[PDB]
Amino acid sequence: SAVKAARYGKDNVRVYKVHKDEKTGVQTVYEMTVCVLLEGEIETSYTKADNSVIVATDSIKNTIYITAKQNPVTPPELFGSILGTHFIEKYNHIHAAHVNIVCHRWTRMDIDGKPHPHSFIRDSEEKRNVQVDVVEGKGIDIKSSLSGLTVLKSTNSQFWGFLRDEYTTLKETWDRILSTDVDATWQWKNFSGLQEVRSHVPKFDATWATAREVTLKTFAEDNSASVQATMYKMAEQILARQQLIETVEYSLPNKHYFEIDLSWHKGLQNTGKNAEVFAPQSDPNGLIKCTVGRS
Amino acid sequence: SAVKAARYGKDNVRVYKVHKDEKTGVQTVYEMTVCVLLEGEIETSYTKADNSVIVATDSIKNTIYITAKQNPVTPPELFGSILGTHFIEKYNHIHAAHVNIVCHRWTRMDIDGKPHPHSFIRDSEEKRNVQVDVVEGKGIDIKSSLSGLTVLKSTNSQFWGFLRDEYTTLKETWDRILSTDVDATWQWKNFSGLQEVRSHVPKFDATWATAREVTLKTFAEDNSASVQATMYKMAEQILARQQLIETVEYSLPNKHYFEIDLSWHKGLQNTGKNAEVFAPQSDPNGLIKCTVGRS
Amino acid sequence: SAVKAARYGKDNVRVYKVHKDEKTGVQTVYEMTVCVLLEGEIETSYTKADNSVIVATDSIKNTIYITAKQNPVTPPELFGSILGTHFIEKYNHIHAAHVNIVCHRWTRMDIDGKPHPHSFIRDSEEKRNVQVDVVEGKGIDIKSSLSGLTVLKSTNSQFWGFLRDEYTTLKETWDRILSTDVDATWQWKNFSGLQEVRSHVPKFDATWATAREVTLKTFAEDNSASVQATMYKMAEQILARQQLIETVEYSLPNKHYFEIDLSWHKGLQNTGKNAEVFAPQSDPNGLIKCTVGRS
Amino acid sequence: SAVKAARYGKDNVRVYKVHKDEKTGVQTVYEMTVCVLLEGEIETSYTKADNSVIVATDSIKNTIYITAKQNPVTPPELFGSILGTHFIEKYNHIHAAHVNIVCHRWTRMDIDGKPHPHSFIRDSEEKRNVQVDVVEGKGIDIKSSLSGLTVLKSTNSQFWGFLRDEYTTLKETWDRILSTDVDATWQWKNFSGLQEVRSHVPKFDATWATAREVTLKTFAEDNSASVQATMYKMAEQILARQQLIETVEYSLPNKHYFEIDLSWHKGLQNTGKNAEVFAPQSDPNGLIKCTVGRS
Ligand SMILES: O=c1[nH]c(=O)c2nn[nH]c2[nH]1
Ligand SMILES: O=c1[nH]c(=O)c2nn[nH]c2[nH]1
Ligand SMILES: O=c1[nH]c(=O)c2nn[nH]c2[nH]1
Ligand SMILES: O=c1[nH]c(=O)c2nn[nH]c2[nH]1
Ligand SMILES: [Cl-]
Ligand SMILES: [Cl-]
Ligand SMILES: [Cl-]
Ligand SMILES: [Cl-]
Ligand code: NA
Ligand code: NA
Ligand code: NA
Ligand code: NA
Ligand SMILES: [Xe]
Ligand SMILES: [Xe]
Ligand SMILES: [Xe]
Ligand SMILES: [Xe]
Ligand SMILES: [Xe]
Ligand SMILES: [Xe]
Ligand SMILES: [Xe]
Ligand SMILES: [Xe]
């Protein structure tokens, strides 16, 4: 037998950082969960019990805190690139670092119509994530994403003209509820190293904001022919607005809301144009994916 | 042996309702999870296998949908009271109904600075809940609550002057992070029946909004001496603003964020006034409760 | 305003303890999650910011570890009683302690048909729990429970003869699937203090084992007329077998498995006596409760 | 823009099937959660709103139930292969099917030392899974796995001789607790189609059982030098025992249990050889992966 692939590290490292502006008194907080996995010339720890090649996962944890102390943690694309680069430069035998960061929302509170200097609220479990792969001699690959963005529209979604055969019971519809949890990922062109990532720093937050805006606007405004057609429109627009993105991937559950026929009870009308009360279905759900790239 | 207490019903009934304004085209959605448990002269179903006394839980589920079809579902205090009353009036041998409702947020989307007519976002897992107990000959008891409101302040929290003995290691502090998930419940004076609940309908949404506002403002502005002292201030204010509330209960976890000493690494300073990077602790957590009533 | 009730403490304190037999080499592990909440003359911490009355929740955490170090942690009824008593004896102004313990399963592994001396498996998320309320001058109240015991029987469950009215669509059945997650609680007669709890130590594990055995046997053997009738039979037997129990409470979800009519597809027969493939329903579910005591 | 990749289908389809032996009266239940995603010539549904190419996800759901009705559901490797093949044979424009199955445990109950004919218990949340990729003209690729197998050993784990530098605080140890949740996957050699999968049917359950046995035995018996070294030993043995497996992958969290120094309290000794009470850590955790193949 032989080791074909190996990676190891620390997962679920929770980190909070505060920035205090001495002049204004304003404080800003950041909270993330970080995973770092390393690869390199480490096969002997598996095959020969040679621990001499292991950077202890506890040390990886220490390194995350130290790096957060000495560097900005925002945008997460930059922080992940700094953290990943550290490992491949510090350790001769480590040749790749894989860094995943989940950013948790802490939104500044408005009290009496003014922004509070040091109080925050978690408005939704929506996350902003990055995956950064730093590979020695191959640069830095960054995938940025938003996830956990849950939306619903109560009309202006249709689904008709699909294949019908002996397995089909679904009725065509010209008016249905559409609800989904959005997972959208944009993959950046490969960067040659940290200097190049630093040069593009302003694009990271701007592209995240654009991806979010395009997602919400397209969802709200499209008279949707299917989840497929609407998601493609979203991806198309993101690619048009940021030339440094190579691909956009969406993964969307179709969370069903079923009509409830109540006509058995005193002829009560609750279907089609009369539908007011629906039963949300926890499972099963549709799952629709697509990756859109350039011509 | 004897049946000392019994209740049965349907839990986890998900319900969505849409209201369509024909004039404006504006649609408004409501989504809830409902539990209804009944009590009454039902002992023989347990002791003698006499099902004749059982209103099937499946029928309870049907009744929830029918009631939502024929009545407003907002405010939830009113809907729960209508639903509970139905059971004690319809069935001679049922003498109490216990209705729990969890309301899920669907907030209208703003697209280009205007409110969208039919598109919604789930902004946070914060819930608005009601517990309604309808007891034949004893009226309607309503407890209203908000839960899952997660907040953090990065300074202006202290904790010193606590008891110190041979079990104590905790250092006094004049500056710490305070973060909690707020669960707040206000208990209404007993109502004589549905007519009285209807007469107070405008107070339900207003009191919820007040409870939320007071919670957020007090949290942000109090230079907190302890979770205990800050929560008492919140409850005091709510009671002062709504005379129909008899008691206010808060239950607050103290979600700890620990300093990380990094001085072992190149004398790095990250504690006390130099603290920037903290480790959020998933467990254990403090849990602090209080019920405040009138003199 | 006045403080009507208050309690505070530490939740989610995870504890592991190992016992090592020096002679045999056999090791036994215990793992629990503990919550301790205190009550007493502590109102001034809420109303006057007087922390002098607060035993810090961090100290409560330390006390749990120290107590586990110096005392047996099994049976949990005894450990909870020792822990609760500690607080009311040590602190003059604390008059009640409320201790909740969840015991996690670590079952010794069998390797090649022999019990391994130091290796364990988590066989199921079933828990054994205790709630211990130690109230100064009123003794020790103990509720013991098992929870998370998930079972299913594929036949020998019926449900017919229930009330039918204009809200009813459910068909009577003489053969259905019955599946539930068992939550069963037995409440001990009040104990005068720790000496009395110690005197009954052997009864705690034996009664837990009996409660489990009776639950499983009755479920498997009863030709069930309803969840109500079957659960009553369980409670009756437990009460008959342990005279020191005052009441037994069961809380049982009815987790539905629905027939799937496939006759639309090539006349395929999958209902009634021909039913083979079913759709488990995640929600809604029935919820059936009963508390059984002595004549 | 262009569609670079697309797949769509139904997730979270819960399925239960019962088999009734008419002779013995013995019933056997199977319960699974199934996901099916399709690929093929479906780009126009995304780009042109052409639904004519879409097999509705609702139809995919129907197909899962129909297929379960007409075929054995065990071993899951065979069922997944039947289900996947169905889609590529039935629909000209569908060229790949991806089927994921999670099998839930329903273990027959022993009542009074005999196996009960129709009553079952969920003993642990351990799962048996399959991923089946059926690609037109490229055969059937099957990855089988077990997951959620949670184990702990209280001694006979060491970790010393790792790299020490200015980022290292971890002390070497010759005696620690080792606890993990096992995720193990074995990848079968490519099969040419359903006939070949059918020919190997007996190997599927046998290899699952072997993988489980080897995992448990090696964990219990290895005097572990690291998670890395122990996991490699497991994978090596599985490969030696089944020649039709090409690779074995393990992914193992290292769930830490920390010593608690209690010496501050009356010189209490609870570290090193005196360690009895430990604090389980919910996060962070080590994460160690390896893929082992043949020379
Ligand atoms: O078994 C281990 N492997 C590792 O890589 C490691 N790092 N810290 N502790 C550890 N334990
Ligand atoms: O056992 C049952 N008890 C009930 O109360 C009920 N209601 N619907 N189905 C049911 N099954
Ligand atoms: O606000 C607090 N209240 C308490 O009771 C406590 N105990 N430890 N830290 C604490 N903080
Ligand atoms: O938007 C949809 N896309 C689909 O592929 C589908 N299948 N069923 N309903 C559906 N809705
Ligand atoms: Cl769908
Ligand atoms: Cl606390
Ligand atoms: Cl039910
Ligand atoms: Cl580790
Ligand atoms: Na390197
Ligand atoms: Na009545
Ligand atoms: Na006392
Ligand atoms: Na095909
Ligand atoms: Xe951070
Ligand atoms: Xe969408
Ligand atoms: Xe609703
Ligand atoms: Xe607070
Ligand atoms: Xe323990
Ligand atoms: Xe039951
Ligand atoms: Xe199944
Ligand atoms: Xe391991």
> Domains in chain B, start-ordered, CATH in brackets?
1-295 (3.10.270.10)
Q: C254: exposed, middle or buried (C-beta count within 10 Å: 0-12, 13-18, 19+)?
A: buried
A98 is catalytic: no
C-alpha–C-alpha distance, residues D245 and D291, integer Å = 12
- The reply to whether A256 belongs to the active site is yes
β-pairing verdict for A178-188 and A139-153:
antiparallel
With tokens 């605080």, the residue in question is D169
Q: How far is the CA of C188 from the centre of ligand 5 (A)?
A: 52
CB distance C75 to C44 below 8 Å: no
> What separation in angstroms does the CA of A211 have from each of A226, C293, D18?
20, 61, 48
For residues C67 and C32, what is the distance between their CA atoms, to the nearest angstrom?
Answer: 13
Distance CA A141, CA A191 (A): 7
The nearest alpha carbon in chain B to C10 belongs to B286
Partners of C143 in the beta sheet?
C131, C187
Distance CA C142, CA C123 (A): 26
Kindly report the length of chain C: 295
Buried/exposed A194-207: b ≥16 CB within 10 Å, e otherwise: beebeebeebbeeb
| Closest Cα to atom 1 of ligand 18 | C227
CA distance to A154, A259, B69, D84, per residue, from A275 (Å): 11, 7, 9, 37
Residues D86, D24 contacting (CB under 8 angstroms)? no
* Separation between Cα atoms, residue C145 and residue C164, nearest integer Å: 36
> According to the entry, how was the structure determined?
X-ray
Name the amino acid, one letter, at C107: T
Give catalytic residues of D, as residue numbers: 10, 57, 256
**Hey, which residues does C141 pair with through a beta bridge?**
C133
Q: Whose CA is closest to B276, among B259, B256, B257? A: B259
DSSP class of residue A91 equals: -
| Rounded Cα gap, residues A94 and C90, in angstroms | 55
User: Does ligand 2 lie within 6 Å of residue C64's CB atom?
Assistant: no
Distance between Cα A202 and ligand 5 center (Å): 37
At A80, the amino acid letter reads G
Interface test with D, best of C10, C29, C230, C277 (most D CBs within 10 A): C277
Record: contact A169-C264, CB cut-off 8 A: yes
Instruction: State whether the beta carbon of B13 lies less than 6 angstroms from ligand 15.
Output: no
Regarding the beta carbon of B165 and ligand 2, being less than 6 Å apart is answered no
> Is residue A22 helix, strand or coil?
coil
Is C75 in a helix, a strand, or coil?
A: coil
CA distances from C229 to A220, A236, C51, C235 (A): 52, 61, 53, 10
Q: Do D155 and C111 touch (CB under 8 A)?
A: no
- Among B53, B162, B231, whose Cβ lies nearest the Cβ of C56? B162
Given a contact cutoff of 8 angstroms between Cβ atoms, the answer to whether C72 and C83 are in contact is no
Q: Which two tokens stand for residue A37?
A: 């996995």
Cα–Cα distance for residue pair C149/C184, rounded to 1 Å: 9
Burial of D28 (0-12, 13-18, 19+ CB in 10 A): middle
If we measure between CA atoms, which residue out of B213, B154, B219, B209 comes closest to residue B181? B219
| Residue C42 to chain B, least CA–CA distance (Å) | 10
Please give the distance, rounded to the nearest whole angstrom, from the Cα atom of residue B250 to the centre of ligand 20. 44
Instruction: Please give the Cα distance from B198 to B191 (Å, whole number).
Output: 10
Residues of A in contact with B154 (CB under 8 A): 18, 27, 29, 118-120
CA A277 to chain centre: 33
Header resolution in angstroms: 1.7
Tell me if B273 sits within 8 A of B252, measured CB to CB: no
Q: How far apart are CA C185 and CA C143, in angstroms?
A: 6
For residue C13, the ligand closest to its alpha carbon is 17
How many helices (H) and strands (E) are present in chain A, helices listed first? 6, 12
User: What six digits make up the tokens of B143?
Assistant: 């407890």
A58 labelled binding-site residue: yes
Q: What would the DSSP string read from start to end of B91-133?
A: -TTEEEEEEEEEEEP-EEEEETTEEEEEEEE---S-EEEEEEE
CA distance to partner chain B, nearest, from residue D285 (Å): 13
CA distances from A128 to A74, A102, A148, B150, C165 (A): 11, 6, 9, 18, 52
Q: Which helix (H) or strand (E) holds C143?
A: strand C139-153
Cross-chain Cβ contact D290/A58 below 8 Å: no
Asked if residue C32 has its Cβ within 6 Å of ligand 17, the reply is yes
DSSP one-letter string for D92-111: TTEEEEEEEEEEEP-EEEEE
Residues of C with CB under 8 A from a CB of A: 166-167, 169, 264-266, 282-283
Two tokens, residue A201: 């720093």
DSSP states along D134-198: EETTTEEEEEEEEEEEEEEESSSB-B-S-B-STT--PPPBSS--EEEEEEEEEEEPPBSSHHHHH
